[PDB]
């Protein structure tokens, strides 16, 4: 057991986002070609996965953050992180 | 220790697949723009990773499912999950 | 607890890289359409994530390798693995 990370990237700069679960929280580090900085994403969790896709120039990110009990999807669509509709079962 | 997830996405709808290892099995939840539903993928495992790529409009998915002893590659190529040639060592 | 893997792919062959953390080390298995073989990447770690992007025909890979204490970014840009600038905090 260590930290656990997830990564996604887009474009040809590129932009990179690295999510790290450690000590009960998932945080986000960002690269847009100018140096690493801390992103806005911050949620509880012990495990994280991520995927992203471009629509034209606009990035859309989905982070699947899992605590001990619940996987919550968090959505970046250019204007803040929002709770997604994802559920693990119907 | 929690559930562990992996995610992939494709297209501009987009389609998303989220694989979750929990309680000894890896299951799959799917988004094609119309709501989340449970996919056909179901294999034993404690850890999962995934990658996918498009060939034209056709998606190809590779899921790396790891039990306590073995990582098995599972392949989606439009017509069922099949065992892949992946091995961890030669 | 098992092995832990991460995967990335590119192109339409495709090429695939699967990173496996097991027994203290992260190793790499490669598919370029001709069979699986062992890649050059080998670093200590218990957890791994990966992302990659193409610039034209040239692949660029970023592997985030985490030991018990440190996440190190490793960079493939066509001519060897190099230590990346990534840090988890500023
Ligand atoms: O410009 C940085 C930022 O807005 O990029 C998109 C997301 O990664 C956000 O969490 C992050 O703060
Ligand atoms: O709100 C954005 C959303 O619709 O984007 C597609 C999927 O990620 C959904 O779970 C999510 O709710
Ligand atoms: O349409 C759903 C489905 O066929 O999509 C491709 C794969 O994700 C399958 O496991 C899944 O059942
Ligand atoms: O059968 C499909 C296959 O050839 O696709 C490419 C790689 O994923 C291989 O391991 C796999 O066997
Ligand atoms: O041709 C194989 C190789 O050079 O491909 C790029 C990287 O995955 C390297 O670690 C790997 O040895
Ligand atoms: O050296 C290559 C590099 O600049 O590529 C972009 C990011 O992965 C950086 O952390 C990294 O140092």
Author numbering:
A (entry chain A), B (entry chain A), C (entry chain A): 1 to 90
What did the publication describing this PDB structure actually write?
The 6-bladed β-propeller Ralstonia solanacearum lectin (RSL, pI ∼ 6.5) was selected as the model protein. RSL is a rigid, C3-symmetric spheroid with high thermal stability making it an interesting candidate for protein-based frameworks. Trimeric RSL possesses pseudo C6-symmetry due to the ∼40% sequence identity between its N- and C-terminal halves. Here, we describe protein-calixarene composites obtained via cocrystallization of commercially available sulfonato-calixarene (sclx8) with the symmetric and “neutral” protein RSL. Cocrystallization occurred across a wide range of conditions and protein charge states, from pH 2.2–9.5, resulting in three crystal forms.
RSL-R8 includes these mutations as well as two acidic residues replaced by arginine. RSL-R6 and RSL-R8 were cocrystallized with sclx8 under near-identical conditions while RSL-R6 resulted in crystal form I (P213, vide supra) and RSL-R8 crystallized rapidly (∼3 h) to yield crystal form III (P3). The charge properties of RSL at pH 4 are preserved in RSL-R8, which is highly cationic across the pH range and thus amenable to calixarene-mediated assembly. Although RSL-R8 yielded crystal form III like RSL, the unit cell had a shorter c axis (60 Å compared to 64 Å). Congruently, one protein chain in the asymmetric unit was translated by ∼4 Å relative to the original structure. Although the positions of RSL-R8 and RSL are similar in the two structures, the bridging calixarenes have substantially different conformations and binding sites. A more puckered sclx8 occurs bound to RSL-R8, compared to RSL-sclx8. In RSL-R8, binding at Val13 and Arg34 remains crucial to the assembly but the interface is ∼2-fold smaller than the corresponding interface in the native protein. Instead, the principal binding site involves the new arginines, Arg43 and Arg46, as well as Pro44. Arg43 and Pro4436 dominate this interface with cation-π and CH-π bonds to the calixarene.
